[PDB]
């Protein structure tokens, strides 16, 4: 039940804090037939633009923008990339949407089958481990890193990062284009500083699908 | 100890199709290369991929896709093998990049990565295994022939996991550069390894492991 | 689960030599043949052994011996492979005749021999494994290259036992006719499988498994 | 402790035939002989095999086959015993060569081979036991009388295994040179030892154990 | 499972002497005989004891004593064997009379005595075993050669107990009429069976088991 | 702890009672060098004569006289046999003297070694089983049987017959020439009716060695 | 299960052995209406006379004759007292006949009820303790003591003295007028030297009721 | 803790009769007396027994028996009490002689007998309790009035046992010389103590406890 | 089971004095009397108290106090007993009134008060016990002789508690009318009952229990 301080790589000793900005994609055409048809809507593009504008206004030197290989995630990265010029980009399969694990409590509308929790769960857990950890000892400066992916992924990441039961990932909810801020101090401590932040979007332009 | 027949998704309709999977190690490459993009194939490397490509074309098979690691050596061998198999879908993947799958038994002196690597990479390679090695989808009508161009530790760990052998013994296998490794996955969920580290098609003077 | 390093004879002095072992399945043969002596190679069979022989000659290796099964199909492939490797000691063996090593897991419908076969043949194939697969004698100065021309179940059981994988999974492997399978046994007792069921040297139209 | 009645192949129909098995130790031989081919019978040795042969001929039995070890001393006694039993099939075997079957209990000072021998030879002698000692095939109509000309440790281990006594006690038995040992295997699977180390037919001045 | 070295009286001074024990089954006898004294040897019986006697005399051994069962068939064979070994102490015993030592495994249909017999006779035969089969007394200077003329079940149970094999398997052995069985008991407590059911000295036409 | 009614062969069903008369030998020359030197003394012969005379005076038709093969036991059987003419005799090794089992409580003067308890114990126990049991079902008449042997043997027989701890065999004591009477009813029940009886010997002629 | 060496009063230290002679009464009129009618028969008196004669012939200086207060026990003491003149006599209630404890194995003819085992058992056990023990430390000479009582009493005494299961008291049997000899060495060790001895009675004059 | 109603013989017919039991301690006596027969009553003693006797006669009861201890002081008081109750059966007993019933709690300094006494005497006094204190026999028609003339420890132990109080507390009671103690035993098995250590009938100048 | 030596106040200095306590039941009284004041002594009652009084005067003891129950029958007997003991302090008490102390074991049919009485009266009688029955105060130099004139259940419960017997057995005792009961309490805390229900001083025709 207690916090594990070696949830990755515990004590050179690390000096740097990593700020992690987990961003859900914007609105997209769900009905789209093939993956490449599932592109952002006109509203979607407006949302990513605001999200991009907000990150630019923070006055931070972002190191990289890592993103899911799904078309909706790429298209929001395309728009957010404009407001943050000359920032390294990296495509990832690990951050594609999936079914992380059986959510508790259960739900009627959404019950994927055991094979999905098996295949996707190992992938999302692998994403968590590779992207959420304390700094390398060889990192001199504090990093600010953007991760543009999907709802289940982010919510599972957040629960795992905080060492809450991962089963409760579906007790969280994230709007489209929403910024979620995790801090990872070099002693291994994690703090969630905002979740599902879309205070920067005019209320008429906030959605979850 | 016993074979698990629901190692993924056992009998919704039932699968009809067999998947042939061709796990191909990359060719020789400049290890000393400074950045990842400098770690390109050698002149010998290119010769090896050419032979591997030539061999796959000679099989008389209609390959559906070529999936490959995002590492530069894997891409460059895919570039050459792609020429002999024209008009075949290609897909880049991070999952299949080289890593340290898990603690190998018995241990070795030259190569001992630290626990964090087995943690981070192991979950990634295991995720790769699960997403690419399984029996057919029920909605697949025809038998597939699929190429996977990646790296040694990855392939050897895939093979051990596919066969349900202890994954710890992945380093008891060894694979030459440009080598074809054939797994069959019948729709009943059964796996058979049909050849491993095959480079019989390379002239002996052109066979390497680094 | 763990690797046993004294699976035979662990550190008279200490061994210096690596043994390369080349387990070769026989070529195509007339299965319908009435008596054992009728079960001879086919025209295709002879073509396969010729290629296998040609490939071994092209390796530029000084083979020490060719040990073979006493079954007619194994002898006949040894006859052809022996031509390309002139002046190499040959030795006939009963231990390496085909059999049913042990109950395979998972089971199969087409092939179910009865308990007495697993008992009689299993002890024979296990005896073959122990007598031929081990690390070098201490009195051997130079690295050996040894050919073993026998049969599918035998080889697959040898391979599983050599690698210390569950022997029950011998039928999860599959070996083509005339196929070269390479095991290395370093003098520290470590075993590595370097290729399995290699027939990259055969034109695709001439590859079979029966 | 209890007798296993399916120690091989228990109730294609059911067996009708009893197999009489005559395990014969070789005669005296030159132990000091440098190579295996030098280890030939002595003048006394030949006298012993002659008596053993004479005795088997006097039994009035139609022997089906004489199976023998491939060691020179075993062959040479088979050569002499073969004369008195004319027109009886002969078969050479590696399985029946002398070895160290398993760690004997209690231990002995004079004779302590090392673990690798018990491993390699034990599997071979056990394989010999299983392949030659079992109840009749169902397709055998008449009772067989079979001769097996081999070596002391082999026979004593066979006998202990046949009777289902602890095989560790093989060295608690002792067999003279040229000695006949009679096992019966009724078709119900029951084994009876009817004489062991019989050399009552040799004049006392011509009995040896080395 | 392991050999007990203090199965009697292990290292008072220490034993120096080996005891050779010659367990001899009686010859053929009239089973149908009404009273015990009617159960005398047949004409063949007498011929058998004569040969057995002749054989023991030909060994060139100075026998110390002849101990025998008090049953008439055992006495009558002792009478004939005593002639060829003149001036050798004789001693009658009840302990060595025939009985049912213990439940034999596996069971038999023809012969099933009831629990009271295994109780009464078993304690008697076990007492016989202990009193006659042990290592030498320390006060015995010379190696002994001792004859024990008794019955089949007795001998077979003695042999199993002497060798520390499961006594239940006494009926897995079988002994001819007039047959010599040789046990050696070295002064360190070690037992070796050197021949069992030896009747090689009888012409085949004169060998029986009842 | 409770009486076992199948201490041999329990329920044709038996009809006959067996009376068993366990008789210790008379005085003998203990110092005698070889077994054949250990013969009865002049007093010994007097004792056996009285014992014999007493058994003849009982007016019983004795079926057999079984005896130990030791010289002192034979010699007393020779004298007792005279007073009971035409009664079957049988020699036995089972009834020779020995050390039946470790006696409790222990004693200082007499401590034989483990090998004796092993070899002799199995023999005396075998004697007990073969001679002490209920009648055969095929026995029509009540038997009266004499057993001429030795002290340790008899005392061990008695303890075993009564189902008392056999360890207490040395808590009993038996005079030379002494009659000991066991009854074995056909239902398997045993009764000791006299032990170490030498009331028939003049007091000046009673010994235990 | 093992012998208890402090079955009474274990280690001045005792020097003396006590010989104890437990004697059953002679034949008596069982049918007698009142206790005083249950007197010895003409045969009874003959038996006590022989028993008395035998004890006198032992050449022992008896210290006391203790006896049961039942009329048959007194009457045999009267006759035995004649042959041992000037020997202290003592009457006792403790040694009257009773049912000591449930006998094993059971019997059909004789099954007294629980109250008897309760009342009599405590009395016979009290008799055992008061009369059967090792010598007092203050006793210089070896004693020879006579106890004239009844069958169940004696048989229970004997079983308890020897430390055998007392339940087996009915596995013993004692003739009328029979001498039973217990020895109690000063180290606390007990030996039974004869039981139910009537070798001194002509066979035609031996009874058990 | 609870009253046991079958402390002897509970409901064969059922008891109808109540037993009154009058436990009387002896009078004063010469303790210093050398032998038991010297320990006779004093002149005061005789006066006490006379009063006790006089009191029992004045009760107007038909006493059935007077049972008494065999000690001389108990007999001598019975002699005097017997005069006032003419023609009443008398019976001597060893059971009721004085002793040490069991370890008294709490302990005392002046009087500590040793374990052997509690063993020997305790079983005797307990036997006395059981034989004399119980409910009526069914065959007793009339209510009995019974006198028991004995000693202090005996009576006090009887009383504690009769009432089912801890017998260890027997020394918490105290009884004067010549004192009457009355127990009633109704035929349902119930016990009542009606007076204890009653000497109200003695002039105070004539009351003692030794 | 064991005696508690600190049943009150165990070793201000240490106690020197013994307390004699004389628990006296009231005399006969009119039970049928309507109100408590009607329940006065009978003519016989007065005769009884007179004798009890006369007896206490004859003891030659200097009584310190007479404590009594406030019930009319207890007062009236105190009135008569007070005459024979002139100038002795008197004290009335509610604690010593009659009640139901606790459930008696064994139970009775005639008398079954209900749980509330055992609750209310039990606490009162127990309080009486504690306040009046204990060892002397340390400040008391001389031995006391104290009279307590009360009722049957009270006294019997006091006695059981004083002796540390199960209080449940209070009804196993019985006390006559006018009866003296003597408890001694030595300064070490030890209690002895020296007589109970003593009415030896009353002519038999004048003894009652109601």
GROMACS .gro file of N, CA and C in nm, chain I residues 91-193:
model
  309
 1768UNK      N    1  -2.581  -0.414   6.900
 1768UNK     CA    2  -2.582  -0.334   6.776
 1768UNK      C    3  -2.679  -0.396   6.675
 1769UNK      N    4  -2.780  -0.320   6.630
 1769UNK     CA    5  -2.875  -0.369   6.529
 1769UNK      C    6  -2.819  -0.348   6.388
 1770UNK      N    7  -2.849  -0.442   6.297
 1770UNK     CA    8  -2.796  -0.441   6.158
 1770UNK      C    9  -2.899  -0.486   6.058
 1771UNK      N   10  -2.903  -0.419   5.943
 1771UNK     CA   11  -2.987  -0.461   5.830
 1771UNK      C   12  -2.916  -0.563   5.743
 1772UNK      N   13  -2.785  -0.549   5.732
 1772UNK     CA   14  -2.700  -0.643   5.656
 1772UNK      C   15  -2.725  -0.791   5.687
 1773UNK      N   16  -2.755  -0.823   5.813
 1773UNK     CA   17  -2.773  -0.962   5.859
 1773UNK      C   18  -2.917  -1.016   5.853
 1774UNK      N   19  -3.011  -0.938   5.801
 1774UNK     CA   20  -3.148  -0.989   5.776
 1774UNK      C   21  -3.143  -1.109   5.680
 1775UNK      N   22  -3.241  -1.198   5.691
 1775UNK     CA   23  -3.244  -1.318   5.607
 1775UNK      C   24  -3.266  -1.281   5.461
 1776UNK      N   25  -3.210  -1.361   5.372
 1776UNK     CA   26  -3.226  -1.341   5.228
 1776UNK      C   27  -3.192  -1.466   5.150
 1777UNK      N   28  -3.184  -1.451   5.018
 1777UNK     CA   29  -3.140  -1.557   4.927
 1777UNK      C   30  -3.001  -1.522   4.878
 1778UNK      N   31  -2.896  -1.581   4.939
 1778UNK     CA   32  -2.758  -1.541   4.909
 1778UNK      C   33  -2.716  -1.560   4.764
 1779UNK      N   34  -2.726  -1.683   4.712
 1779UNK     CA   35  -2.707  -1.710   4.568
 1779UNK      C   36  -2.771  -1.843   4.532
 1780UNK      N   37  -2.786  -1.868   4.402
 1780UNK     CA   38  -2.843  -1.993   4.354
 1780UNK      C   39  -2.772  -2.110   4.420
 1781UNK      N   40  -2.847  -2.190   4.498
 1781UNK     CA   41  -2.786  -2.307   4.559
 1781UNK      C   42  -2.772  -2.422   4.461
 1782UNK      N   43  -2.662  -2.494   4.473
 1782UNK     CA   44  -2.637  -2.614   4.395
 1782UNK      C   45  -2.613  -2.727   4.496
 1783UNK      N   46  -2.687  -2.839   4.483
 1783UNK     CA   47  -2.789  -2.869   4.384
 1783UNK      C   48  -2.917  -2.790   4.409
 1784UNK      N   49  -3.006  -2.782   4.307
 1784UNK     CA   50  -3.128  -2.704   4.323
 1784UNK      C   51  -3.227  -2.775   4.413
 1785UNK      N   52  -3.332  -2.705   4.454
 1785UNK     CA   53  -3.441  -2.766   4.533
 1785UNK      C   54  -3.578  -2.725   4.477
 1786UNK      N   55  -3.679  -2.808   4.503
 1786UNK     CA   56  -3.814  -2.787   4.448
 1786UNK      C   57  -3.896  -2.694   4.536
 1787UNK      N   58  -3.897  -2.721   4.667
 1787UNK     CA   59  -3.974  -2.643   4.765
 1787UNK      C   60  -3.942  -2.491   4.767
 1788UNK      N   61  -3.817  -2.454   4.739
 1788UNK     CA   62  -3.768  -2.316   4.759
 1788UNK      C   63  -3.697  -2.268   4.633
 1789UNK      N   64  -3.765  -2.185   4.554
 1789UNK     CA   65  -3.701  -2.125   4.436
 1789UNK      C   66  -3.735  -1.977   4.424
 1790UNK      N   67  -3.658  -1.891   4.494
 1790UNK     CA   68  -3.678  -1.747   4.477
 1790UNK      C   69  -3.626  -1.705   4.342
 1791UNK      N   70  -3.666  -1.587   4.298
 1791UNK     CA   71  -3.638  -1.543   4.161
 1791UNK      C   72  -3.517  -1.450   4.153
 1792UNK      N   73  -3.460  -1.441   4.033
 1792UNK     CA   74  -3.327  -1.384   4.009
 1792UNK      C   75  -3.302  -1.251   4.079
 1793UNK      N   76  -3.404  -1.166   4.083
 1793UNK     CA   77  -3.395  -1.036   4.148
 1793UNK      C   78  -3.357  -1.046   4.297
 1794UNK      N   79  -3.401  -1.152   4.365
 1794UNK     CA   80  -3.368  -1.172   4.507
 1794UNK      C   81  -3.221  -1.205   4.526
 1795UNK      N   82  -3.168  -1.297   4.445
 1795UNK     CA   83  -3.024  -1.332   4.447
 1795UNK      C   84  -2.935  -1.210   4.420
 1796UNK      N   85  -2.984  -1.123   4.332
 1796UNK     CA   86  -2.919  -0.997   4.298
 1796UNK      C   87  -2.919  -0.901   4.419
 1797UNK      N   88  -3.037  -0.868   4.469
 1797UNK     CA   89  -3.050  -0.770   4.579
 1797UNK      C   90  -2.999  -0.821   4.714
 1798UNK      N   91  -3.045  -0.939   4.754
 1798UNK     CA   92  -3.002  -1.000   4.880
 1798UNK      C   93  -2.857  -1.048   4.877
 1799UNK      N   94  -2.815  -1.108   4.766
 1799UNK     CA   95  -2.678  -1.158   4.753
 1799UNK      C   96  -2.572  -1.052   4.779
 1800UNK      N   97  -2.591  -0.934   4.721
 1800UNK     CA   98  -2.500  -0.823   4.743
 1800UNK      C   99  -2.501  -0.776   4.888
 1801UNK      N  100  -2.618  -0.781   4.951
 1801UNK     CA  101  -2.631  -0.747   5.092
 1801UNK      C  102  -2.561  -0.848   5.185
 1802UNK      N  103  -2.583  -0.978   5.163
 1802UNK     CA  104  -2.523  -1.080   5.249
 1802UNK      C  105  -2.371  -1.085   5.228
 1803UNK      N  106  -2.327  -1.072   5.104
 1803UNK     CA  107  -2.184  -1.061   5.074
 1803UNK      C  108  -2.121  -0.939   5.140
 1804UNK      N  109  -2.193  -0.827   5.142
 1804UNK     CA  110  -2.146  -0.708   5.212
 1804UNK      C  111  -2.135  -0.734   5.362
 1805UNK      N  112  -2.234  -0.805   5.417
 1805UNK     CA  113  -2.229  -0.844   5.557
 1805UNK      C  114  -2.107  -0.930   5.586
 1806UNK      N  115  -2.082  -1.029   5.500
 1806UNK     CA  116  -1.967  -1.118   5.515
 1806UNK      C  117  -1.838  -1.040   5.524
 1807UNK      N  118  -1.819  -0.947   5.432
 1807UNK     CA  119  -1.693  -0.875   5.422
 1807UNK      C  120  -1.669  -0.783   5.542
 1808UNK      N  121  -1.775  -0.718   5.589
 1808UNK     CA  122  -1.766  -0.619   5.697
 1808UNK      C  123  -1.749  -0.682   5.836
 1809UNK      N  124  -1.800  -0.803   5.853
 1809UNK     CA  125  -1.794  -0.872   5.983
 1809UNK      C  126  -1.695  -0.989   5.992
 1810UNK      N  127  -1.666  -1.053   5.879
 1810UNK     CA  128  -1.571  -1.165   5.876
 1810UNK      C  129  -1.442  -1.121   5.808
 1811UNK      N  130  -1.342  -1.096   5.890
 1811UNK     CA  131  -1.208  -1.066   5.845
 1811UNK      C  132  -1.116  -1.086   5.965
 1812UNK      N  133  -0.985  -1.083   5.942
 1812UNK     CA  134  -0.890  -1.091   6.052
 1812UNK      C  135  -0.892  -0.961   6.130
 1813UNK      N  136  -0.839  -0.967   6.252
 1813UNK     CA  137  -0.836  -0.852   6.342
 1813UNK      C  138  -0.771  -0.729   6.279
 1814UNK      N  139  -0.812  -0.612   6.328
 1814UNK     CA  140  -0.741  -0.487   6.301
 1814UNK      C  141  -0.607  -0.497   6.374
 1815UNK      N  142  -0.504  -0.431   6.322
 1815UNK     CA  143  -0.372  -0.428   6.388
 1815UNK      C  144  -0.377  -0.360   6.525
 1816UNK      N  145  -0.471  -0.266   6.542
 1816UNK     CA  146  -0.484  -0.189   6.666
 1816UNK      C  147  -0.562  -0.262   6.778
 1817UNK      N  148  -0.601  -0.386   6.754
 1817UNK     CA  149  -0.671  -0.467   6.854
 1817UNK      C  150  -0.567  -0.550   6.926
 1818UNK      N  151  -0.550  -0.528   7.057
 1818UNK     CA  152  -0.445  -0.599   7.135
 1818UNK      C  153  -0.491  -0.737   7.181
 1819UNK      N  154  -0.613  -0.742   7.235
 1819UNK     CA  155  -0.670  -0.864   7.292
 1819UNK      C  156  -0.761  -0.941   7.198
 1820UNK      N  157  -0.770  -1.071   7.222
 1820UNK     CA  158  -0.856  -1.159   7.146
 1820UNK      C  159  -1.002  -1.125   7.175
 1821UNK      N  160  -1.081  -1.109   7.069
 1821UNK     CA  161  -1.225  -1.082   7.081
 1821UNK      C  162  -1.309  -1.209   7.081
 1822UNK      N  163  -1.423  -1.201   7.149
 1822UNK     CA  164  -1.529  -1.301   7.138
 1822UNK      C  165  -1.658  -1.227   7.102
 1823UNK      N  166  -1.708  -1.252   6.980
 1823UNK     CA  167  -1.817  -1.173   6.921
 1823UNK      C  168  -1.936  -1.261   6.886
 1824UNK      N  169  -2.056  -1.216   6.924
 1824UNK     CA  170  -2.179  -1.288   6.894
 1824UNK      C  171  -2.253  -1.219   6.780
 1825UNK      N  172  -2.305  -1.301   6.688
 1825UNK     CA  173  -2.383  -1.254   6.573
 1825UNK      C  174  -2.512  -1.333   6.565
 1826UNK      N  175  -2.624  -1.268   6.598
 1826UNK     CA  176  -2.753  -1.336   6.605
 1826UNK      C  177  -2.836  -1.300   6.483
 1827UNK      N  178  -2.848  -1.395   6.390
 1827UNK     CA  179  -2.915  -1.369   6.263
 1827UNK      C  180  -2.988  -1.495   6.214
 1828UNK      N  181  -2.966  -1.538   6.089
 1828UNK     CA  182  -3.056  -1.632   6.021
 1828UNK      C  183  -2.979  -1.738   5.943
 1829UNK      N  184  -3.051  -1.843   5.901
 1829UNK     CA  185  -2.988  -1.966   5.851
 1829UNK      C  186  -2.910  -1.945   5.723
 1830UNK      N  187  -2.976  -1.892   5.620
 1830UNK     CA  188  -2.910  -1.874   5.490
 1830UNK      C  189  -2.790  -1.783   5.506
 1831UNK      N  190  -2.806  -1.677   5.584
 1831UNK     CA  191  -2.697  -1.584   5.609
 1831UNK      C  192  -2.577  -1.659   5.668
 1832UNK      N  193  -2.598  -1.728   5.779
 1832UNK     CA  194  -2.489  -1.798   5.846
 1832UNK      C  195  -2.421  -1.899   5.754
 1833UNK      N  196  -2.501  -1.979   5.685
 1833UNK     CA  197  -2.446  -2.085   5.600
 1833UNK      C  198  -2.363  -2.030   5.484
 1834UNK      N  199  -2.407  -1.917   5.429
 1834UNK     CA  200  -2.331  -1.846   5.326
 1834UNK      C  201  -2.204  -1.786   5.384
 1835UNK      N  202  -2.213  -1.728   5.504
 1835UNK     CA  203  -2.095  -1.673   5.575
 1835UNK      C  204  -1.992  -1.784   5.593
 1836UNK      N  205  -2.036  -1.897   5.646
 1836UNK     CA  206  -1.948  -2.010   5.674
 1836UNK      C  207  -1.877  -2.059   5.548
 1837UNK      N  208  -1.951  -2.076   5.439
 1837UNK     CA  209  -1.891  -2.123   5.313
 1837UNK      C  210  -1.788  -2.023   5.262
 1838UNK      N  211  -1.821  -1.894   5.271
 1838UNK     CA  212  -1.731  -1.787   5.226
 1838UNK      C  213  -1.608  -1.776   5.315
 1839UNK      N  214  -1.629  -1.789   5.446
 1839UNK     CA  215  -1.519  -1.782   5.543
 1839UNK      C  216  -1.418  -1.894   5.518
 1840UNK      N  217  -1.469  -2.015   5.495
 1840UNK     CA  218  -1.384  -2.131   5.470
 1840UNK      C  219  -1.330  -2.138   5.328
 1841UNK      N  220  -1.374  -2.047   5.241
 1841UNK     CA  221  -1.337  -2.047   5.099
 1841UNK      C  222  -1.384  -2.174   5.026
 1842UNK      N  223  -1.497  -2.230   5.070
 1842UNK     CA  224  -1.566  -2.334   4.995
 1842UNK      C  225  -1.661  -2.267   4.895
 1843UNK      N  226  -1.701  -2.341   4.787
 1843UNK     CA  227  -1.799  -2.284   4.694
 1843UNK      C  228  -1.921  -2.233   4.768
 1844UNK      N  229  -1.953  -2.103   4.754
 1844UNK     CA  230  -2.069  -2.050   4.825
 1844UNK      C  231  -2.203  -2.115   4.780
 1845UNK      N  232  -2.206  -2.167   4.658
 1845UNK     CA  233  -2.324  -2.239   4.604
 1845UNK      C  234  -2.371  -2.354   4.694
 1846UNK      N  235  -2.278  -2.413   4.770
 1846UNK     CA  236  -2.312  -2.520   4.863
 1846UNK      C  237  -2.363  -2.478   5.001
 1847UNK      N  238  -2.407  -2.352   5.016
 1847UNK     CA  239  -2.459  -2.305   5.145
 1847UNK      C  240  -2.579  -2.386   5.193
 1848UNK      N  241  -2.661  -2.433   5.099
 1848UNK     CA  242  -2.778  -2.511   5.134
 1848UNK      C  243  -2.747  -2.660   5.159
 1849UNK      N  244  -2.621  -2.701   5.145
 1849UNK     CA  245  -2.580  -2.835   5.185
 1849UNK      C  246  -2.559  -2.843   5.336
 1850UNK      N  247  -2.546  -2.727   5.401
 1850UNK     CA  248  -2.543  -2.718   5.547
 1850UNK      C  249  -2.686  -2.704   5.598
 1851UNK      N  250  -2.707  -2.736   5.725
 1851UNK     CA  251  -2.834  -2.713   5.793
 1851UNK      C  252  -2.811  -2.677   5.941
 1852UNK      N  253  -2.886  -2.580   5.991
 1852UNK     CA  254  -2.865  -2.525   6.124
 1852UNK      C  255  -2.993  -2.528   6.202
 1853UNK      N  256  -2.987  -2.581   6.323
 1853UNK     CA  257  -3.103  -2.585   6.410
 1853UNK      C  258  -3.132  -2.446   6.466
 1854UNK      N  259  -3.253  -2.431   6.521
 1854UNK     CA  260  -3.294  -2.308   6.585
 1854UNK      C  261  -3.217  -2.293   6.717
 1855UNK      N  262  -3.166  -2.172   6.740
 1855UNK     CA  263  -3.088  -2.141   6.859
 1855UNK      C  264  -2.946  -2.196   6.857
 1856UNK      N  265  -2.897  -2.235   6.740
 1856UNK     CA  266  -2.771  -2.309   6.730
 1856UNK      C  267  -2.649  -2.219   6.723
 1857UNK      N  268  -2.547  -2.257   6.799
 1857UNK     CA  269  -2.420  -2.185   6.802
 1857UNK      C  270  -2.327  -2.240   6.695
 1858UNK      N  271  -2.266  -2.150   6.619
 1858UNK     CA  272  -2.168  -2.186   6.515
 1858UNK      C  273  -2.043  -2.102   6.538
 1859UNK      N  274  -1.928  -2.169   6.553
 1859UNK     CA  275  -1.802  -2.106   6.598
 1859UNK      C  276  -1.699  -2.099   6.484
 1860UNK      N  277  -1.664  -1.977   6.445
 1860UNK     CA  278  -1.553  -1.953   6.352
 1860UNK      C  279  -1.441  -1.886   6.428
 1861UNK      N  280  -1.317  -1.926   6.399
 1861UNK     CA  281  -1.197  -1.864   6.456
 1861UNK      C  282  -1.121  -1.797   6.343
 1862UNK      N  283  -1.074  -1.675   6.365
 1862UNK     CA  284  -0.992  -1.606   6.264
 1862UNK      C  285  -0.859  -1.557   6.324
 1863UNK      N  286  -0.758  -1.646   6.317
 1863UNK     CA  287  -0.623  -1.615   6.362
 1863UNK      C  288  -0.569  -1.493   6.284
 1864UNK      N  289  -0.477  -1.417   6.346
 1864UNK     CA  290  -0.427  -1.291   6.289
 1864UNK      C  291  -0.342  -1.307   6.163
 1865UNK      N  292  -0.295  -1.429   6.137
 1865UNK     CA  293  -0.234  -1.463   6.007
 1865UNK      C  294  -0.335  -1.477   5.891
 1866UNK      N  295  -0.465  -1.468   5.920
 1866UNK     CA  296  -0.570  -1.469   5.818
 1866UNK      C  297  -0.637  -1.603   5.802
 1867UNK      N  298  -0.593  -1.702   5.879
 1867UNK     CA  299  -0.644  -1.837   5.869
 1867UNK      C  300  -0.776  -1.847   5.940
 1868UNK      N  301  -0.868  -1.922   5.880
 1868UNK     CA  302  -1.002  -1.942   5.934
 1868UNK      C  303  -1.019  -2.089   5.966
 1869UNK      N  304  -1.078  -2.116   6.082
 1869UNK     CA  305  -1.115  -2.251   6.121
 1869UNK      C  306  -1.258  -2.254   6.173
 1870UNK      N  307  -1.337  -2.349   6.123
 1870UNK     CA  308  -1.469  -2.378   6.175
 1870UNK      C  309  -1.455  -2.483   6.286
   0.00000   0.00000   0.00000
